Each structure stands twice: as structure tokens, then as C-alpha cells.
Design a binder for this molecule. Structure first.
Ligand SMILES: N[C@@H](CCCC[NH3+])C(=O)O
Ligand SMILES: N[C@@H](CCCC[NH3+])C(=O)O
Ligand SMILES: N[C@@H](CCCC[NH3+])C(=O)O
Ligand SMILES: N[C@@H](CCCC[NH3+])C(=O)O
Ligand SMILES: N[C@@H](CCCC[NH3+])C(=O)O
Ligand SMILES: N[C@@H](CCCC[NH3+])C(=O)O
Ligand SMILES: [Mn+2]
Ligand SMILES: [Mn+2]
Ligand SMILES: [Mn+2]
Ligand SMILES: [Mn+2]
Ligand SMILES: [Mn+2]
Ligand SMILES: [Mn+2]
Ligand SMILES: [Mn+2]
Ligand SMILES: [Mn+2]
Ligand SMILES: [Mn+2]
Ligand SMILES: [Mn+2]
Ligand SMILES: [Mn+2]
Ligand SMILES: [Mn+2]
Lengths: 298, 298, 298, 298, 298, 298
């Protein structure tokens, strides 16, 4: 299927400057060339225009920083993603902080009966204004997409929820807020923390994940946050957490997904050039995209 | 069960300065806070007073450096640990070179019919004056606790041996003196060298270890030497050996032990701030303690 | 005097991706805040729109890569800078590869009888299509501004030359192409290579430079290329050259310039986040700007 | 003159754990051996007992954290230093955060008509409860010794002030709070910030400093804070500030002082093993002490 | 069986200087000492004399650089290896770029009915003048040994092919040229790329490899290219490729081979001191050789 | 004057393996290319054949390790150097441990009435069997050349002494053995330790050195030991000593010597690839050679 790249230079879902440079860092790491090589009809649709954050004092509220700007940008993203899907192309979204998942999922989900999601990350991203210890929307996209959160975020695209809890698989988690542990537990979301990765190995984790979703969804969205990988492998992220997934485990994960042919949409987020060591993180993301799209060693 | 912390600023069992700073580096790495967060009744009993070593030429055996001072301090530790166990609390001992295991085991062992020991280390620590290539008592604690060595060491606490060979499991070993290989072989001590860890995986090694001990002991003491981990993960150790256990394997190990609920006492040793990179090693110890005491990702 | 910031996300004057991210890396390194603290009326005019380069095979000269797009963008910059000077504000230009000096000098020069230029760099940037070993316009801005090169470059702003050779002082030079050595020699441009910096000391070099220019110009433009500093201090540059100016020498230089009160415009260029170590280079630029604008230790 | 070493494991004048390990890190870096080699009658008097900080809520006040504990410890230090001086020995104090300077100066000053002070540091340490942005007493010792501050600190030793402003020379300063700049300016304290070091060179700075003091004091106290050196040379400090004095400049400074024979008392502070890279900082301090006490290359 | 060491200071099969220093870096890393310790009758036969590259204008070597010189050196190597085998000694060949495999296999193969080969590498080394993107013979030894390539290479030793495709097992591959992918695919060579290593694990991979070869060969040659290990573990190699085999995986591999007792000859290649970090790579090689030759942890 | 390169792969004058690799690491760092570029008639005469160390039990060398082998190699070197000088060519000797200076000076000195020597080093290299704390001849070449030491060393070339103490200038010294301090002091050798470099600066030091020698010699030999530079700049050396000469200071030194046109012969020694970081040290050497031979920035 042809691919359309949409850059979302988003940094409103958080407070550290630099993550808005993620889309072009990956471009500069050679994302187009890498995929053309695999014989893809790749198209770069450019970047979604992101506004300037409204003063904290007139925004949606403290627990939801930049609510309106984040919401607006996500609306635009959702429209772009929708069009791409309508054109029969695979939407490959580049971030940008994780709050963009709200827009991506909004543009995609409506096209599937039962959309599944693989959240490759160090965090669960299932906070709400109530549970968030930061007020940063980049830590709420999964919860919002499940229909839990401020309506300005849960209603992006004019519908909700985008996916069901039983259709989500979290992988690589190692940093959950108390509220989130409760949410995951209560909503019954399938999760493989680093404990399971270390205990079962990435091969079993991926095998179980693929089987689980293939068995109950009609499309699967890969929402990959680079902080899911260990900071030594992906140093350029806003909220790094040690003891993460290795460079090799991540390639095995992408290769298995490619092999399974279940990924129908994808986004690579949280790449921050300003916190990186010579674009290493954007490079990992591009290499991972290569594997996901079929690049093989033999 | 409530926890009591006992610091043993010991460096007499070896020759490199700095390991005596281990207890406070771990305190500064936040050991109390980490455990309080887990809802424990944690108490810090302070540090055992360590004497000064007498003139080497006045010492009566070069194969046992600082014997008197090491024995003396270990007696004190044994008393302290005994007191804690008597009070119904779990003794968490912080080192300090590994020779302190002699005191810890002396204070604990007497309270169990068949105490088991998990020696997580790169070394066997089973030397004697006869086999030691260094004369450093920090390389003799396991042998001494098994009743093999100078009576000044084997009789701490007024009894011997503290544990039986068939109740010991060595994990992470990769540096054994010839005499030690003979000792382990002949005494029939269960050992998983890096070869087994690589070949079987930490999960299998830990499963077998837990099953083995749970099946024949009434308490299990964890004697964790930070040099068991790779020097890249735990740089601050006096006798580093490459090709060690990773940060993740160690967390998995602690997590499985916690899960099994078999650990009845523990000690974290060989942390040396002076050979470290910004307290990294002390921090690893604290994070591993978190996992040992039940800290979970989900 | 109030300051106006103009970002020029330019990478057309060279071939390595990333230098276009320079303006925002410096913004993220806190340029506005640093200057506001000094009590300045600082204004950020945004970024000059940079077009896309036309097909190389369609371009009419390989010795002048991206000539049209580079000229076009420089025209825009010149207009913007002119506007700022007309408004009685100091133009602070952020790059972006060094080819932007053509636009900056074009907008400024017209306002002075004898504009002086301090070129703090590892290179002379005095190549022409004839002498350039690369065809990269970023290595030609000083020559072009002196009226030497392709008219598309020498005529930006509708006039030429912008400055006279006798009013230029090169500092920190350590990498000159043969043609450039000839140019500097023949045009009689004052130059302090690393040999002079080492031999005389930065203090003497700066004293002589300030006296020289103050004695014959009515305004002085500081064109600071971060690659003038040693790669260990400023790693994020496209063409690093070892044996450069230290962090301290650069602060002393800026401090002496501020003290002299001769700088009437300035530009900080060649910052590339993608070749950097956690925005270090952009940070150095911001700290140097602080000193240039009067920041003092006591 | 014979030397007496007094360790002051102080961390109450600040908030980061670890600086209390400074005295023994330097001991472990071999301070005694280094000085014995120079044929000194060196004596180690041990460490001053430091209490536990009183709860913020019952202490002297917010702007003066741990006031009573700091004061008390300084009283003890002053008594110890006084005795040493009375015994005709040179007092060499090892810290420990800089607040210990209050005790050292109290024990020394009373023995001189006009005691001079060389404050080798990145900071001025002339804050008061009024000007302090932290409430940390380690940033007030110089001001307190000049008689400016809370009486609990200004009256240590039963007298004040300990020295006169005109008898103080600050060297290496590069991080002053606004209040401090005012204090220095108004009290007329001689200061050589990094600007002067870069501009005049360490040789001239030291020459001027030595002449200045030799010309008006009857004894000179060297209060050396390791953060005075660049963080790359002395990484183990609580409040590092970039762009500092090099390893060589510091040795030249010590060698010139030794040569001048004007230093009558000294203290090396802020060494923190826990923030260091393999005791590098304590090692620098010991090497510097070697130079100060006469160690020469030829 | 007694061991004979033959150094082959070869760098003709490639273009980066330094790999000719491989043999002595390993000797300096203690290869003799390490093997003597295991009680071997080790003999060092010295180095094969290698020639100088003749003028390109003279002889042609665009697709086959240094053909004559590489061929002549390999003839010498083949003779030396043959003699050692004839003397009933195990030939341990130290390189030197991988083109030396042509000579090693030529001297060994003729002595076995069905010689097997384990090619531990990041590359396939199965290029031909036709498929090679570099013209570097160090990327053609496996193809040449299989009887595919220039006769000057395929006929070394006076016979061809040296081994059969079905008796070859590639391990650690992660960088194959298109032509090589086709070759491996068509020739039916057994291969475990990093995908298989990650998916099955090194234990499984080695078990399958040993059973596969033991089941159909009468001897097995280990051709170990240090670049098979990740660049972080073996930095000193001419063509590093990230995402490689770890230091522990490699030890496990060597330990299992020793255990299986199937290796009848071996070579360690591509060690380049000039691209290394303090002989780290030569050190890993010596360590791996120790394991291969029976060194055990217990 | 035409240049002849003579490699001396010597490691007999010391005990750490690797320094014998110095000559080719420099060749690989591009020494020929660098000098040809300066339009020199450069010739590479190859390497002096060096022997193997004979059994300690056989010949004695505790205070004079490898005496016979070091002496014999130096005789060969002396002949080679003599011939080159006889042919009217400048002898450029590449080491190899510093003991080779004995052979270089032996081949050169006889051709001058008053040969001067600039010993750029961290050490004095003026030990004798009596004063040497190591028995390593690489720490005795200067003393031996001055006619002090074992006759096997002092008589190389059939004459002694090669030079006079008053014609020697040591630069960069920071590590002298007590006996050496006495020797230098008593022999009246001119020396600039790091204290003088720091105090006077490299410009002053070189000016004084050039005027001193130019005023009383008819030729000057540059004996440059890379360990004279700081270990951060030249990491690959057998006996590094911190607080050394910077990369820039060394270039200035070479630039001033070239300018003075007083150097008539030279040798670059102690380069050890095996203790280096990617040939960095050999690279610095080649760079310094370029400056020495006239390479200029302008
Ligand atoms: N859970 C944290 C971190 C989220 C990071 C998202 N990129 C929060 O909600 O603030
Ligand atoms: N086995 C060695 C090293 C022991 C290290 C103990 N911490 C010895 O006995 O000396
Ligand atoms: N002088 C070289 C390098 C210039 C670098 C400019 N930023 C050239 O003209 O290509
Ligand atoms: N000036 C700052 C830092 C002082 C650091 C003293 N060691 C303060 O007063 O908080
Ligand atoms: N496959 C590449 C790299 C080979 C590397 C061999 N050591 C080539 O043939 O050029
Ligand atoms: N002075 C010491 C070190 C000399 C190093 C010579 N390269 C010695 O003679 O052993
Ligand atoms: Mn995350
Ligand atoms: Mn996320
Ligand atoms: Mn151990
Ligand atoms: Mn141990
Ligand atoms: Mn430049
Ligand atoms: Mn430039
Ligand atoms: Mn300070
Ligand atoms: Mn201070
Ligand atoms: Mn390879
Ligand atoms: Mn290979
Ligand atoms: Mn030396
Ligand atoms: Mn030397």
C-alpha cells in the first residue's frame, strides 16, 4: 500500500522545547529514502500547522495545559489522516509529542470495525486531568482515545471512543503513575511491562501480542514512542526512563509485525533532536520504520 | 515485616580504599525513601563501628589480612543482626566489602533450621588462607560461613557452620580461583556461572534457584555483591569483572524473588563511591532493593 | 538599543542537513530570556522563508550550488534586516549556514559610511565559483560581500560591495583553501589565525582588532560562526576543524567587544542541532550573545 | 611548620547529600602520604562531630537552613583550629561544604593583626539571609566572616569580624547573585572574575594578589573551593559552574603561593565523591595541596 | 592437539590502513599466555610476508583490488597452514582482513572429506567481481572458497572448491549486498541473521548449528570476524555494523563449540588497532579464543 | 632539504607492548602525504630491524633491561641516520620508545660542531642504571647521549658524548625522578617545566629556547616525545602524565621552530596505537610534523 507521511511538529502536549523538531530530524535521518529503497510509493504531505499555546490563565485548565491549541492541532491532524486513509494510502505520522496520537487515532479509527492498538512505550499515556501529575496532555492520548478525558480531546473527529480497551496492547512499560495503574487494571488493558519482556523475552511478547490482536481486530495501529527504548539507545526523548527495550529487541518487534502484516497505520513520536546525541534517536526511528515496512537482513 | 537497616562501613576485608563509603552512598541514593514508599516500617540502626587494623608486621598471618579487626567488627554485626531478627524485623545490611557476610550470616543463621543462601556475585568468595591468592578476607566469607577457614572467622557468633553447602546457590559467577573451583565442585554447591545465565536465561536460572531452595530451607538470605553486575552497569566496585549480569536481569531476579516471598534477610555489598561514576552503583543497589521489596512496574 | 531577532533557517549554502534548525535550537537554548534579563527591548521577527532548491541538472552552474534559492532567500533577509535598522533597532540574525551573511551585510551596510566586519571563524569564507573546492555558497559570503563572485550574490540589495577589505578582521582562522590564502593576501585583509591567537593571546588580538576598526569605521558587524570554536566546545557544526578557540577565549572576546561598544549588528551562524550533543552548541551561542550584549560576571 | 589535618564532614550548609564525604575522599586520595613525602610533620586530628539538622520548622529561619547545627559545628571547628594554631602548627581543614570557612576563620583570625584571605571560588559566598536566593549557609561564609549576617554565625569564636574587606581577594568568580555583586562592590572587596583571569592571565592575577596582600596583612588564609576549577577538571562539586579555572592554572596558583610563602592556614572544600567520576575531584585537591606545600617539578 | 599460530598482516583485501596490525595487537593482548594457561603446546610460527600494492595503472583491480598481491599472500598462507595440519597441529590464523580466509581454507580443506565452516560475521563475504560494490577482496573469501570468483582466488592451493555450500553456516549477519542475498538464497547456505539470533537466541542458534554440521562434516573451521560483534563491543574493525552480537553471546558461542569439540581449525580476523579504543577488540578476540580452546568459568 | 623517513619499531627500552607499532601508525596517519603536500622530496627508508629480548637469566638487565638488544638496534639506527645526513638529507626518525634517541643522536651529532637538542617531553630521560627506578632504557637516552651511562649506550657510533648539557633545552617536563632532578641541576641543563610554561607561556618559552640555541649551536635536533602533550590530547603513550602541553601549544611550538629554521633533524617517539583512541596520537604527531616542516594556516 502506498505511504503518506504527515509531520506533526507538536510540543504543546508537554513543556520541554525541541520535540517539535522531531518530524524533520527523522526526515533528515532519511525516512523517505529508506522507504523508497523498499520500492514504496512514498509521499510526504508536509507538516500540520500547530498554533501558539494560549496563556495558561485563559486555557481549558491547569490539569490540561494548552488544551485548545492541542485540540485544534489534533483536529487538523485527524482530517489529514482521514483523507490519506480515504485515498487508500497508509498514514505514517511523525511527531512531535505523544498527544498527536489523539489526532492520528481520530483519523484512522472511524475506518475500522475494531481497530487494535500497540502502544510501544515506557509510559501508559492513560492519564486524565484528574490523575495527571503534570497537566501535560502528552501523557493522556491513550486514555482520551479510549473515551476517557476532557471532551475537547475525546471528541476529536466528532466521535468517541476511537478504540476499545480489549483491543490495546502496551509494550515496554516501566513508568506508570498510580492513577494509570488503576486505569489499566480496571479497564482491562493488555500490558507487557519490562518485567514480562525480561521474563518472557521479546519473541514471546510479540507472538502473543500479534495473535491476540489478529484474533479480534480488523486493523492495527502502531503508536511507537521512542522513549520505549532504553535512553542509551534513544537518548533524545523528553521523559527518558532507564531499563528499557534494546535496539535489537525493537528491530525484532518491527520485523515480526511486518511479517504478520497486521499494521494498518503508524506513528513515531517523542523524537527530540535537542536532547539527542547527533540525531541518534531520529536515526533509530528511521531504521525501525525500515524494519516495519518490510526491510529484511536476508 | 518491618525492616531495620544496618550499615557496615567495612574495608578491612580488602585493600582498596572507599568501599567503607558504600553504606552512606546507598543512603544518599535514597534507600529509606525508596522503601518507605512501598509502605514499609523502615528503621535505620546506623553503622557498626569498625576498628583500625594493627601493624601488618605485628599481624600473625599474611594469608588473612586484618583478621583481628575483621573478626571483631563481624562479631558486632552478628550481634546487631541477631537483635533485629529477635525483634521480628527483617535485617537489611549495607556494605562495605563482602567480608561482612560472615557477620550477617552469623546473626541470622542461628534463627533457622535450614537457612538457604543466594550468592549473587562474579566471584565464589570461597577461599581460605590456603587457597586465597590475595590474603583478603573479603574473598572468604562464603567458605567461612560454611565452616571452612580460620576459626576466628568460622566461629563468629559462637557457632559453626552457619549454612550447609547444599543450601547455597551461586549466581553470576565468572571469576573463580583454582582452589575455589575445587571447593565448589567438592562441596557440591549449586552454581550458575555466566555460561548458564547465557545458555538458560535469567528466568530459568531464577525459577530453578527458587524451586531448589523453597524445597529444602526455612529461610533464604540474599547476599548481593554489586560486582555481580557488569562493570558498565555497576562501575563502582573494587574487583570488577567484565561480561556480567545486566541491569534488567538483576531487576527480573529481584522481582522474581519478591514474587516467591522466600527472602528472609539481605545484604548489598561492595559498593565503592570512589571508584564509581556519580553514585551510579549505589543507585543500582537502591533500585534493586526496591524490586526485592516488592516494587512493581504495573 | 532595542534588538530584533531574525531567524534564517538556511541550509542551501551547503549539503549537510540540519543547519536550518539552528535558529530554533538557539531560541530553545533561551536567547530571548537571556537578553530580556539584561533589560533589553527584544523582539523576535520570526524566520525568513527559504525556498526549495531546483533540480541540480536544471541549475546552471555546479560551482554555485543552489544559487537561485540562496540569492532569493538572501534578498528577503536583506529587506528584513534593512527594515530593522531603519526602525532604529539592532539586527540580531540567527543561522543557518554562513551564506546568510550575504543577506545580513546587504541590509546593514547601506546604512554606514564605512562598515567594519569581524569574521570570527575557522574559515575565511572568501571563495568564488573559481576558487571553491566545493561549490558550496556558504564558503563564499565574505568574498561576495566584498564584491567578489557571481553578481547574483554580489548584487543582493541592489548595490556592491557592502564593505571594504581594509575594514575586515578575521579571527580564529585555521582552514583556508589555497585560493582563499591568495585572496586574503592580495586583498590585504587583516587576519589572526590560530597561530596569532596562540602567539599573542586573545586579549592582544581583541585589543588590536578593536583599535583597528574603531579607528576607521562607523559601525561594526560581528559575523560569528560557531565552528570558530573548537569542536569540543562547539560540536554541532557542519565543517568542524580541530585546534580552535576555547569557550573562555570566546567569552573574553564578546566581553571586550561589549566593553568597546563598537558592534552595531551581529549574526550567529552554522549551528546544527543534528550534529550536536544535547544542544551544547546552541547553548554556547546563547551564552556568547549574553556576553556580547553586556552580561558581566561582576 | 608542622601540619594538622582536621576533617569537617559538613553538609548542613547545603541540601545535596555527599559533600560530608569530602574529608575522607581526600584522605583516600592520599593527602597524608603526599605531604609526608615533602618531609612534613603531618598529623591527622580526625573529624569534627557534626550533628543532625533540626527540623526546618524550629530552626533559626527559612533563609538560614540548619542555623543551629551549622553554628554548633563551626564552634567546635573554631576551637580545634585555635588549638592547632596555639600549638604552632599550620591548620589544614578539609571539607565539607563551604560553611565551614566560618569555623576555620574564627579559629585563625584571632591570632593575626590583619589576616588576609584568598577565596579561590566560582561564587563569592557573601550572601545573607536577606540576599540569599537559597537559604543555604554554604553561600554566606565570607559575608559572615566579614561580620555580615546572623549573629549566630558572625559571633562564632566570640568575636567579629574575623577579617576586613580590604584584606580579601576573590579569584575565579563567575557566579554571583545580584545582592552579592552589590556587597562586593560596596564593601570594596578585590575580585578577579574569570574575565580578569582570561584577560590578564593567571600569572598576573596571582602576582597582583600576592603583592596586594603581602603589602597589608600579617598572615593569609587560603580558602579553596574545588568548584572554582572547571567542572571538567573538578566534576564532584555541589554547585558546578562552567568556564572555570583549569587544572594547570590551579597548580600555577598554588606554586606561586608556595613560592611567596604567605599562606598561614588553608582549607579545601566542596569535594563531593557522590557527584564525582572516580574520586577525580579529591585527587585534584590533594595534588593542589602538594603544590601549595612546596611540591615542585624540578 | 598442539596449536600453531600464523599471523597474516594482511590489508590488501581492503582499503583502510591498520588491519595489518591485527596479528600483533592480539599477540600483545596475550594470545600465547592465555592458551599456555590452558596447558596447550602453543607455537607461534610468525607472520606470512605480505607484498605491496602494484600500480593500478599497471595491473587492474577495480572490481578485484590488489588481486595478484592478495593471491600471492594467500598461496603462502595456504602452504603454511597445510604444513601445520600435516604436522598434526591445529592451525590458529590471526588476521588481517578477511581475504586471508582464502588461504586458510586452502591449506585446511584438502585434509577433510567434508569440511564444514562457521562464518561468524556481520557480512556474508560472498561477493564476486560482478556483485561487489567495492572491488574489495575481503568481501569475497567465502564465495571464492565455494569455487565462485576469479580463478586466481578460487584455485589457491591448486584445487577448488574448498567446501560445499551445504556445509556452511553464517552467524550474526546483518549487512548483505543484493547480489550476496541472491547467492546465499540460491546456493542454499544456512544463515542466522541477527533476526534469528534475536528470535531464537544464541543457545538455539548454536545448538542447531552444531547439530547441523556434526551431522555431515568431518571437520569444522571457525572463521570469526570480530565485526560480527556489535561496534560497542568490538570497535576496532574496518566495516562496523550496529545491532551486533554481544560480548556474552560470543562467549557462549565459543563455549558451546568447545563443548561440542567440533572445531578443527580457526581464524580471528579484521582486528584493527588503529580504529580501536585501547586494544579492546584484540582483547575480545583473545578472550574468545580462550573460551574456544576450553577455558571455563567453573 | 629532502627528507628521509626511518621507522624504528622499538619497544625494548620499556615493558609495555605496542610502542613498536608507532612508526606504522604514523605512516597510516599520513606522514608521507602530509609532507609531499608541502612539496618535499620525501623518502621512506623503511624500518630498522629490531631484535628479541634474550633470557633475563642469560644476560643481565635489571637496571638496564634489554641492554644488548637496545644497543644493537641503536647501532643500526646510528648508521642509517649517518648515511642520510651524509646524503645531504634531513633524517626524520619515527618511534618507537624513546631509547631510539641514542641511535638518532649518534648518527647526527658527529656532523655538527655544537649540536643542540630540544627535548619536548613530560620526562627528563636522564636516568642511569644507578638512578633509574625502572631499569627501563627509554628513560636514559638523554643522559646516555650526554655521555652518562653504560658504555654500551654511551659509545654507540664510536664516540661520546654526542652533545653538551649547555646545548640542551627540556620543554614540558612534569615528571622527574629524584636522581634526574639532581642530574639536571648539576649538569646545568636548561629546563622549562610545566610551571614555566604556565608562568611564561609557550610563546615566551619558545622564544627564549630558540634564541638560546641559535646563539650557540650549529644545528638543533628536535626529540619530540608525544607524552609531552597532555594525555587527553595524546592518549596513546606508555607513561602519560596529566597536566601537559595542549594541542595548540604544540602547534605553536612547531610553527615557531619552522619559522626560526633551526631544526636540522627530528624524531617523534612513544606513539602507541594499542593504548590510543583511534590513532589520535599518531594523528597529532603527523599534524605536528606538518607544522614543523612549514605548514602554515595563512
Ligand atoms: N506519565 C507522565 C509522563 C508522560 C510522558 C508522555 N510523553 C505524565 O503524565 O506527566
Ligand atoms: N577471589 C579473589 C577476589 C575476591 C573479591 C572479593 N570481593 C580473592 O579471593 O582475592
Ligand atoms: N572553505 C570550504 C569550507 C567552508 C565552510 C563554510 N561554512 C569551502 O569553501 O567549501
Ligand atoms: N550563591 C548560591 C550558591 C552558593 C554555593 C556555595 N557552595 C547560594 O548562595 O545559594
Ligand atoms: N560487503 C561489503 C563489505 C565487506 C566487508 C568485508 N570485511 C563489500 O563486499 O565491500
Ligand atoms: N622516569 C621514568 C619514566 C621514563 C619514561 C620514558 N619514556 C623511568 O626512567 O622509568
Ligand atoms: Mn513515553
Ligand atoms: Mn508515549
Ligand atoms: Mn564479587
Ligand atoms: Mn562477593
Ligand atoms: Mn566556518
Ligand atoms: Mn563561516
Ligand atoms: Mn563555590
Ligand atoms: Mn565556596
Ligand atoms: Mn564482516
Ligand atoms: Mn568477514
Ligand atoms: Mn616522556
Ligand atoms: Mn621521553
Amino acid at each position: 500500500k502506498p505511504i503518506s507521511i504527515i509531520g506533526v511538529p507538536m510540543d504543546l502536549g508537554q513543556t520541554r522545547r525541541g520535540v517539535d523538531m522531531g518530524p524533520s530530524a527523522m526526515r533528515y535521518a532519511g525516512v523517505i529514502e529508506r522507504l523508497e529503497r523498499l520500492h514504496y510509493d512514498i509521499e510526504d504531505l508536509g507538516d500540520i500547522p500547530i498554533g501558539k499555546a494560549e496563556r495558561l490563565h485563559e486555557q481549558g485548565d491547569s490539569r490540561l495545559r494548552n488544551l485548545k491549541a492541542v485540540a485544534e492541532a489534533n483536529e487538523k491532524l485527524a482530517a489529514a489522516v482521514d483523507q490519506v486513509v480515504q485515498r487508500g494510502r497508509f498514514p505514517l505520522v511523525l511527531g512531535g509529542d505523544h498527544s498527536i496520537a489523539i489526532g492520528t487515532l481520530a483519523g484512522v479509527a472511524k475506518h475500522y470495525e475494531r481497530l487494535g492498538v500497540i502502544w510501544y512505550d515506557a509510559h501508559g499515556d492513560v492519564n486524565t486531568a484528574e490523575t495527571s501529575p503534570s497537566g501535560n496532555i502528552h501523557g493522556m492520548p491513550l486514555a482520551a482515545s479510549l473515551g476517557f478525558g476532557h471532551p475537547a480531546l475525546t471528541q476529536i473527529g466528532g466521535y468517541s471512543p476511537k478504540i476499545k480497551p480489549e483491543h490495546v496492547v502496551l509494550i515496554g512499560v516501566r513508568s506508570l503513575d498510580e492513577g494509570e495503574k488503576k486505569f489499566i487494571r480496571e479497564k482491562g488493558i493488555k500490558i507487557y511491562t519490562m518485567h514480562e519482556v525480561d521474563r518472557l523475552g521479546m519473541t514471546r511478547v510479540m507472538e502473543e501480542t500479534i495473535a491476540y490482536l489478529k484474533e479480534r481486530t480488523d486493523g492495527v495501529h502502531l503508536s511507537l514512542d521512542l522513549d520505549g527504548l532504553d535512553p542509551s539507545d534513544a537518548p533524545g526523548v523528553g521523559t527518558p526512563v532507564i531499563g528499557g527495550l534494546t535496539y535489537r529487541e525493537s528491530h525484532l518487534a518491527m520485523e515480526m509485525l511486518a511479517e504478520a502484516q497486521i499494521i494498518t497505520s503508524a506513528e513515531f513520536v517523542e523524537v527530540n533532536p535537542i536532547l539527542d546525541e547527533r540525531n541518534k534517536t531520529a536515526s533509530v526511528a528511521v531504521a525501525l520504520m525500515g524494519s516495519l515496512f518490510g526491510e529484511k537482513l536476508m
